[PDB]
Fold:
Amino acid sequence: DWMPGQPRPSYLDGSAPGDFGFDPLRLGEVPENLERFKESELIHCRWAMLAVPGILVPEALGLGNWVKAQEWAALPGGQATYLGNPVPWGTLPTILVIEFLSIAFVEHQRSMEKDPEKKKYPGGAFDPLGYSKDPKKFHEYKIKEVKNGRLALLAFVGICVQQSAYPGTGPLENLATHLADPWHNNIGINVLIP
Amino acid sequence: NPSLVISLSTGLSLFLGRFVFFNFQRENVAKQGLPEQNGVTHFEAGDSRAKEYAGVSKSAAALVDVLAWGSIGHIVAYYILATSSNGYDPK
Amino acid sequence: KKGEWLPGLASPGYLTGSLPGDNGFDPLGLAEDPENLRWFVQAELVNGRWAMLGVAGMLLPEVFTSIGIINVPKWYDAGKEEYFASSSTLFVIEFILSHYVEIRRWQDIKNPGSVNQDPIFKQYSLPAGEVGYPGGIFNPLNFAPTLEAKEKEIANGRLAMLAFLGFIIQHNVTGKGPFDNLLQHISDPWHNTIVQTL
Amino acid sequence: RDLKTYLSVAPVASTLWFAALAGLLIEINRLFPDALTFPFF
Amino acid sequence: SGLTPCKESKQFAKREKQSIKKLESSLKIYAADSAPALAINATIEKTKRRFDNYAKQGLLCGADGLPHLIVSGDQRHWGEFITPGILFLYIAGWIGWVGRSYLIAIRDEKKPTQKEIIIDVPLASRLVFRGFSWPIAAYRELLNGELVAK
Ligand SMILES: CC1=C[C@H](O)CC(C)(C)C1/C=C/C(C)=C/C=C/C(C)=C/C=C/C=C(C)/C=C/C=C(C)/C=C/C1=C(C)C[C@H](O)CC1(C)C
Structure:
């Protein structure tokens, strides 16, 4: 039980990785569905692990905001830039096509899997270092991944919510704003009134 | 922009159809099967599939497939051609 | 023999009298069902406990202020301004902690086995066996939690709640303070009563 | 007469009940007329 | 809230004015010291009091000159809808809960219909004040609220 004193649902015997017996809605009663879920949690997590840094690091520099980068796309011509340099491939139609074409192919590739999407742990070219060589060791890593992935997903959120309300977004920035006067600057002020 | 855009989109679409999404699309068609009213639909109905027109020498693709992907191709392409000249402007 | 909240009447049947502070008082049959009774017993405890501090917190400073030993605003006034940090921050804080410590005793109510996990490391635990009567660090002095001793806690709580009910209602209409209200009554009781005020 | 009590508590119980209700409502209005809102909060 | 508060509505003032003149007109035939006169002067005083309260309680008015109610949930007008309503649901719940307490008391008995046409007033008087705490019907709902057979 990871809700301190709450009986664990039947299906979760705590053997899965990241299994803390949490499923108040029992969306996992169905085995076929749960398996799909385990796969998805990882996917969603993998991105998130990537996204926070993606969003956070540039701001430490000249990102200003994840939001800000999206800003050029709206006006014609862009052209947008990565590090003060326009292009290559600057305009939106080119990026959109490149993204749609490049992406669709990679994912659909996923949608050609059996053996539980290679157990959502493909480990082909992907595990070059072959961390998964050792089963005992491999298991520990999965837990790390999920816990880390979860941590990341949760954080992304806060970014969006924080980003909401404070359209003067400053995920890294807000923190400062918190730091300055943490007592009079908190979400609390945001949960209430002027 | 020229007429060349039509070709790339249609070309890519066709490409997508023939080598990327081709295996999956068929898998689905097999499962879906043809329509049946109480079972099959050719049983009365005068009208039934055309096996011959369906058949093709290429290792995988058929003429009908060409039609659909090309159409998506043309549509997607014409879609880009029009959004260009509208010069629509938003906030 | 038990205590009768009403001498002539008889006690209801679900009131065994094995409970502290039992005087056969359930005229509306709210506790006919036993489960409801357990829940209510716990509820009476806590509603009674908060009221104790609250009445005390509310009343004493008013008294001390009049004495002049210290100066603090009247309870119905602690709220406006004058605190390090805003009102909002305190709330969210109050909420996070209260949320944890309770969403906390609740577990012990459903199933009485949430005494471990103290602190995060598991070395320390709570040893005992009555719901709403935790032990360990909770009872540093180890006063016997004697039944009858529990009788006293409840009585005070029940009393506190009438007081609390009194303070708030008294506040309106009066527009003053409980101690103040008392002084007015004390100065001249026959001329100061609910009658002259309403 | 037990029995008389019994005639009562029939649909005469309805009228005695509603007459009491009507009276109460009427007095309230006489006391607080033309109320379109609850203004005490 | 495209309306203007009644306190500052000309139409709302014209209605109070016109109404009082109508009642005062009738005042003329009866002379002074008189029963009808006192009755009419009492209606006039009841009229002034009415309009006075509406303005006093911040009720908007419409171009018609009559107050209009806001039921959106807006905080300035809970008096208009929400406050009275909760009051209702309390009473409605009370009546229904007491009514259902009676049928359950009656159900396992002799001829149950006998006490549906001839009320057991001792039993009813015993159950009427149970409606005071009827929203602890909620705690019955956690267990024996409604029948499982259906
Ligand atoms: C039993 C029964 C059964 C049968 O059958 C029927 C009948 C008869 C119905 C019944 C009933 C009963 C009753 C009446 C109960 C009640 C209770 C209460 C009142 C409580 C309170 C209770 C109360 C309470 C808790 C309260 C608390 C409070 C507090 C803490 C306070 C605090 C504070 C302070 C310090 C200061 C500031 O400035 C303010 C504040 C912040 C506020």
Remarks:
- The first helix of chain A runs from residue 31 to 60.
